[PDB]
Amino acid sequence: ETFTVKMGADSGLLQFEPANVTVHPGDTVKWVNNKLPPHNILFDDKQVPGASKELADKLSHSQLMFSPGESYEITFSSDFPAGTYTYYCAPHRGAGMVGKITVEG
Ligand SMILES: [Cu+2]
Ligand SMILES: [K+]
Numbered sequence: 001e002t003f004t005v006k007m008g009a010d011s012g013l014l015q016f017e018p019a020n021v022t023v024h025p026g027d028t029v030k031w032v033n034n035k036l037p038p039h040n041i042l043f044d045d046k047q048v049p050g051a052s053k054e055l056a057d058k059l060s061h062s063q064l065m066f067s068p069g070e071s072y073e074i075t076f077s078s079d080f081p082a083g084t085y086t087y088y089c090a091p092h093r094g095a096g097m098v099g100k101i102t103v104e105g
């Protein structure tokens with residue numbers, strides 16, 4: 001299954017929408033650039049299962065997305081550890097533009 005997360009709410013709020021997503025192995029999360037760009041998607045090393053920097057760096061899309069409809073996807077395959085992956089947008093960090101993917105297992 002694919003879950004679409006908007007970067008910037010339709011309401012014009014600096015939020016990921018939905019901010020919290022629960023996922024099963026094999027699912028994809030697709031971020032779509034929506035309102036009030038730019039946005040990016042950063043996972044800190046201590047905010048993914050096992051605190052793996054190698055994992056968090058692979059998943060982080062640090063490059064800025066400016067155009068509506070730009071997208072980035074992660075397929076959380078069985079290669080991914082179960083647990084929480086907490087992320088944020090650097091440009092809007094002070095606005096609380098944060099999210100969390102929970103991979104069940
Ligand atoms: Cu943002
Ligand atoms: K993070």
Ligand SMILES: [K+]
Nearest residue numbers: 042089090093
């Ligand atoms: K940062």
Ligand SMILES: [Zn+2]
Nearest residue numbers: 044045046047
């Ligand atoms: Zn860190």
